[PDB]
């Protein structure tokens, strides 16, 4: 009895795709062709940081644009200072695997989790003076992919099996669960205004959720390979994605279709981390060809080679105010470029 | 500079010296990894060396050489993305049961577990991240296989089998396929020790294998080849 239901589903998606095709009228490229080019840009290795002895996976800029947190496969978690290159704290962990870290907007909490299918929240401003484990969150039978903070009392995690959850810190419980994906979710980036977020999975599909109700608002599928990075524009209009098919694309929330495609023949590598610079003109991206590239948003063009590394680039971030960027690569280095 | 800046300097240098001490202390530990079908008695194998928590870890030391023992059984997800974390493993202890060629367990229309194990072993060994990592193979349990070969010819699972009803030639056949599954020859090697409820042997063989692989690695790193 699944054949008839399958055929109504097929015709429904067919007419939806037909409506999507009918909606589009023109491409953004020739509309924005008259935008003046930005020209070449040169960045420099203004500062360097060392002290790690192993791989580096993730980093996150603080809300005040002065503090930095970075993880490593070695069971250490060190907090840096952006300006004077001083070490502030060392956080010895229990499990020796980390794949994501987060920094609280109030500058009091940090989070870190990895393959142990466990989530740990830490407290910094303690009366005694030493960091201590606050609470342990368990219940996911899969490897975590990303942890983000919505406020000082809510934690959002993108699991590995089929789901993403919305925890609360007051009690070790679950407010709600989200289902609808088939593969494994890779990224989960919150929005500048806290009522929406998207979490693409390993099925070349991206679903946009609602924080309060809990229903799949939209659904997109245009890529051929896996999705590995997601980010938002400064406002709540558009977002851009990155795949393993040596290409990046961006969409629109209202238009619900594709807008531009980035492709250059010599590119054969993949995409690892993607972020948008402020003012919404420059889109940065770290590739797998030992290099990092910068592109123009409204025009398909290249501006420079932000690359002086010796291995793959793993984590990439941008300060809130916009003073500089950061690229933590596969080697045990970390360079701030301005 | 104000005094707070200097105080930050001493604090930073103390943290740095703590980090270097911890790194140099923890740099002299060897890492081992396990893989298998799941019904291979991996827990029992761990128990012999010993004498929802997806990753379980144990420590044991024999005659002053620290070993770290792993497990990746409890993931139940796609393997293509979480395998690159373990690029530093010195050796991999692959274990598979050989007597369970019959008694179809997964699906009646599907094939026996022998070919599934062969495909899994091929995928594990021929991956590009582990091009310079030795592989160690153990056979789980034997006496049951010995008492079943007498009542059933081995060719029931192997159409190209042409041997007699004797243990030694059929065994040599089995590790013949296990050996020639590989296609990258000089760098790696396989050992294929037979353990069946035998004490004092598994740890000794593991020690010999890890010493061999570590001395080969040091010789390669010293520019003698």
């Amino acid at each position: 009895e699944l054949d008839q239901l399958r055929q109504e589903a097929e015709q429904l998606k067919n007419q939806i795709r037909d409506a999507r095709k009918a909606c589009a009228d023109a491409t953004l490229s020739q509309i924005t062709n008259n935008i003046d080019p930005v020209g070449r840009i040169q960045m420099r290795t203004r500062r360097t940081l060392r002290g790690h002895l192993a791989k580096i996976y993730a980093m996150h800029w603080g809300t005040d644009s002065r503090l930095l947190v970075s993880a490593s496969q070695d069971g250490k978690l060190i907090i840096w200072d952006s300006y004077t290159t001083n070490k502030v704290h060392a956080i010895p962990l229990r499990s020796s695997w980390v794949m994501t870290c987060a920094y609280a907007p109030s500058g009091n909490y940090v989070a870190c989790g990895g393959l142990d299918n466990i989530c740990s929240i830490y407290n910094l401003k303690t009366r005694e003076g030493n960091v201590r484990v606050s609470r342990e969150l368990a219940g996911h039978t899969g490897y975590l992919s990303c942890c983000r903070f919505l406020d000082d009392n809510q934690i959002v995690t993108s699991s590995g099996d089929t789901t993403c959850a919305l925890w609360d810190i007051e009690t070790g419980q679950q407010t709600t669960t989200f289902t609808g994906h088939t593969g494994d979710v890779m990224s989960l980036s919150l929005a500048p205004d806290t009522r929406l977020f998207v979490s693409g999975a390993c099925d070349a599909s991206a679903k946009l959720w609602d924080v309060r109700e809990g229903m799949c608002r939209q659904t997109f599928t245009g890529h051929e390979s896996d999705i590995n990075a997601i980010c938002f524009f400064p406002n709540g209009n558009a977002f851009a994605t990155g795949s393993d098919d040596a290409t990046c694309r961006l969409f629109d929330l209202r238009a619900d279709q594709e807008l531009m495609t980035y492709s250059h023949d010599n590119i054969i590598c993949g995409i690892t981390s993607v972020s948008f610079s402020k003012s919404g003109r420059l889109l940065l991206a770290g590739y797998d060809d030992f290099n990092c590239n910068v592109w123009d948003a409204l025009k398909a063009d290249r501006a420079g080679v932000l690359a002086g590394h010796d291995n793959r680039v793993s984590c990439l971030g941008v300060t809130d105010d916009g003073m500089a960027v950061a690229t933590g690569s596969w080697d045990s280095f970390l360079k701030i470029w301005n | 500079l104000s005094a707070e800046d200097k105080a930050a300097v001493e604090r930073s240098k103390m943290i740095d010296r703590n980090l270097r001490e911890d790194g140099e202390k923890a740099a002299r530990e060897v890492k081992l990894l396990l893989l298998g079908a799941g019904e291979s008695g991996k827990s029992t194998i761990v128990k012999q060396m010993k004498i929802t928590t997806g990753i379980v870890e144990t420590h044991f030391t024999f005659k002053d050489l620290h070993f770290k023992m792993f497990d990746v059984g409890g993931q139940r997800s796609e393997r293509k993305k979480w395998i690159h974390c373990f690029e530093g493993v010195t050796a991999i202890i692959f274990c598979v049961a050989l007597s369970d060629y019959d008694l179809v367990l997964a699906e009646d229309e599907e094939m026996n577990r022998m070919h599934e194990s062969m495909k899994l072993f091929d995928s594990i060994c021929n991956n590009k991240w582990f091009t310079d990592t030795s592989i160690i193979l153990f056979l789980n349990k034997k006496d049951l296989f010995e008492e079943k070969i007498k009542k059933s010819p081995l060719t029931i699972c192997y159409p190209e089998y042409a041997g007699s009803n004797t243990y030694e030639e059929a065994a040599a056949y089995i590790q013949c396929q296990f050996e020639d599954l590989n296609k990258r020859k000089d760098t790696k090697e396989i050992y294929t020790h037979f353990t069946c409820a035998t004490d004092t042997k598994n740890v000794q063989f593991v020690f010999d294998a890890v010493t061999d692989v570590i001395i080969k690695n040091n010789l390669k790193d010293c520019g003698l080849f």
């Epitope: 200072d81 704290h89 005694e128 003076g129 | 104000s2 105080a7 930050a8 001493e10 103390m14």
Partner: single-chain antibody, 233 residues
Framework: DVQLVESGGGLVQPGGSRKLSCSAS????????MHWVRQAPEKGLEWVAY????????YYADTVKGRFTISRDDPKNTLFLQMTSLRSEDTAMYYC??????????????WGQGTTLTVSSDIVMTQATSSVPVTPGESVSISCRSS???????????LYWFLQRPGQSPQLLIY???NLASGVPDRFSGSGSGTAFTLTISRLEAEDVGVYYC?????????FGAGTKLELK
Amino acid sequence: DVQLVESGGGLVQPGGSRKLSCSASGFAFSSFGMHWVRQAPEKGLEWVAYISSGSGTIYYADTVKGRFTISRDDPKNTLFLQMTSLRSEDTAMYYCVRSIYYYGSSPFDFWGQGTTLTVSSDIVMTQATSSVPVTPGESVSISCRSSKSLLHSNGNTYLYWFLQRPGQSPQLLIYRMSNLASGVPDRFSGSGSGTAFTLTISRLEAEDVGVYYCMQHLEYPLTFGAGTKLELK
């Protein structure tokens, strides 16, 4: 808790030698630095010594530079002094102060209880006012002046505030200008620029009576303030 204990005391004839000790109660003694402070019987206070973690900086004062020494040991969490010969100016109150220095730190957090001992260039703090009658509730303004400008090239000031109820040890109120402390209400506040600085308070209550001090932390021989007494007629 973070409770501390002081031991040693009594009277000693001039030229005698003694030792004083302080004991820690579970606050990671091996990661924090600490001081000692002299409190005159009816006068202000003085700074006598300083040690830091790792036995790196062993600074002293400029009046007792030779007759005093400090020693610390990580196990058992204890800090020591040594005396050689005491004159009539050494009879005063002796204290203990804990201080940690990092980026977002608040030095001079907890103070001790103290013990009694009876023998039997430098920046100046003006604090011209000494006593000001106050009502049960009103706004009170307290001001102090310095010799050199406190503004450093970084862009942060280095003046502290304090309070002391009768018969009790002090506690921190403002660790840096326009930064409220930890464990105090929001009624207090402060503002200032250049060298002249002023403390302002919104409301009063019958627990704020005491004496207010003033610090400075640019040039290592810390020079204390004068002190202002409130009587609350």
